[PDB]
Design a protein around this nucleic acid. Structure first.
Ligand SMILES: Nc1nc2c([nH]c(=O)n2[C@H]2C[C@H](O)[C@@H](COP(=O)(O)OP(=O)(O)OP(=O)(O)O)O2)c(=O)[nH]1
Ligand SMILES: [Mn+2]
Ligand SMILES: [Mn+2]
Ligand SMILES: [Mn+2]
Ligand SMILES: [Mn+2]
Ligand SMILES: [Mn+2]
Ligand SMILES: [Mn+2]
Ligand SMILES: [Mn+2]
Ligand SMILES: [Mn+2]
Ligand code: NA
Length: 326
DNA sequence: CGGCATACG
DNA sequence: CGTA
DNA sequence: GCCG
């Protein structure tokens, strides 16, 4: 059948129900904009279920028995199957509230709470925000200045270039340290909104203090347009033909003992990790995050040398990153 | 009905 | 509050 | 919104 947790089934990047999943994810997004995290989760999970199916849904009957499809999500699918559009979805798409909250929350440094307050205050455009910078954090000023570049898809060419310069700085910061590409590109995506890198060292403990040294070295190369420890949310200056563009890059450091858990978490998808942690706690009684896996009965952490170890600890069939596109 | 992942900056 |  |  179809299991109820996304981490129990392979989900490929491309699939056979793209239009149906896209529509449900509009409703999930809108639910988030209104603070309804429960409805967001259900709509996300229902969309993910369709991603995992082996063929296109053609008839409403094919939804019977599928987890996370109830009256609401099935009606969305029925309208799409019958009319090619779902009236609720189209109403969301063209609502001023949805459009403005999408524009605002996609600014680096702006979340749902900030976007909602700005919306209530009457603000609607990026130029509205730029007219009174005094109301902005340093992070939001950077997100607004570079917003256009940050809206341009990051390509694989860009990733190769960025990894080499990151490796150069990491190599000077700490000989022997390694750089691993994570995030959506590791799941096989050809584009991204940013690049994610996970940094470690084979000798436990030697990675301590590493990220400041890396950042200082990238800074003195003039590559850091913005940055603010274990996680650095940066904007890199990336060369382009006769120019350059700003690119969001995340750098994260973990000791080798935690590296499998950090690799798993930063490789995503977001829904996959939420479902994996939910499964861990509620089905296995184990607590999972990007640092480790904790047995609260025996008060001990599971040692893992690989992602494969973690799936085994959780009694789940192993899924390569390419099949974690929940 | 309660739950809905779980961290760091 | 923001970030992943 | 859906599940157990
Ligand atoms: N954006 C985000 N990522 C999260 C969260 N929680 C969590 O574990 N992650 C993990 C799973 C994500 O796939 C991974 C990388 O984050 P990301 O925003 O760069 O997403 P991504 O690489 O998959 O896709 P892209 O939008 O960057 O192209 O971090 C969260 O709340 N937000
Ligand atoms: Mn409804
Ligand atoms: Mn009809
Ligand atoms: Mn990413
Ligand atoms: Mn993104
Ligand atoms: Mn830590
Ligand atoms: Mn990222
Ligand atoms: Mn309730
Ligand atoms: Mn509800
Ligand atoms: Na944002």
């Amino acid at each position: 059948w179809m299991p109820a947790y996304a981490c129990q089934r392979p989900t490929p990047l491309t699939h056979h129900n793209t239009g149906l999943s896209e529509a449900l994810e509009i409703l999930a997004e809108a639910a988030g904009f209104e603070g309804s995290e429960g409805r967001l989760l259900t709509f996300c999970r229902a969309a993910s279920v369709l991603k995992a199916l082996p063929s296109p849904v053609t008839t409403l009957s094919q939804l019977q028995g599928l987890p996370h499809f109830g009256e609401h999500s099935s009606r969305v699918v029925q309208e799409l199957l019958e009319h090619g559009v779902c009236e609720e979805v189209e109403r969301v798409r063209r609502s001023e509230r949805y459009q403005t909250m999408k524009l605002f929350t996609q600014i680096f440094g702006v979340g749902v709470k900030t976007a909602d307050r700005w919306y209530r205050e009457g603000l609607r455009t990026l130029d509205d925000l730029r007219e009174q910078p005094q109301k902005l954090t340093q992070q939001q000023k950077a997100g607004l200045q570079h917003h256009q570049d940050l809206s341009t898809p990051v390509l694989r060419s860009d990733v190769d270039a960025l990894q080499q310069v990151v490796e150069e700085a990491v190599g000077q910061a700490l000989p022997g340290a390694t750089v691993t590409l994570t995030g959506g590109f590791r799941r096989g995506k050809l584009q991204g909104h940013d690049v994610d890198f996970l940094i470690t060292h084979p000798k436990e403990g030697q990675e301590a203090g590493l990220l400041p040294r890396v950042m200082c070295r990238l800074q003195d190369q003039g590559l850091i347009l913005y940055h603010q420890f274990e996680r650095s949310f940066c904007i890199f200056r990336l060369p382009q033909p006769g120019s350059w563009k700003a690119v969001r890059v995340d750098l994260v450091v973990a000791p080798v003992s935690q590296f499998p858990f950090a690799l798993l978490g930063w490789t995503g998808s977001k829904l996959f990790q939420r479902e994996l942690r939910r499964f861990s706690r509620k089905e296995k009684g184990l607590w999972l995050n990007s640092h480790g896996l904790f047995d609260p009965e025996q008060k001990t952490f599971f040692q893992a040398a690989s992602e494969e170890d973690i799936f085994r600890h959780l009694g789940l069939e192993y899924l390569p990153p390419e099949q974690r596109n929940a």
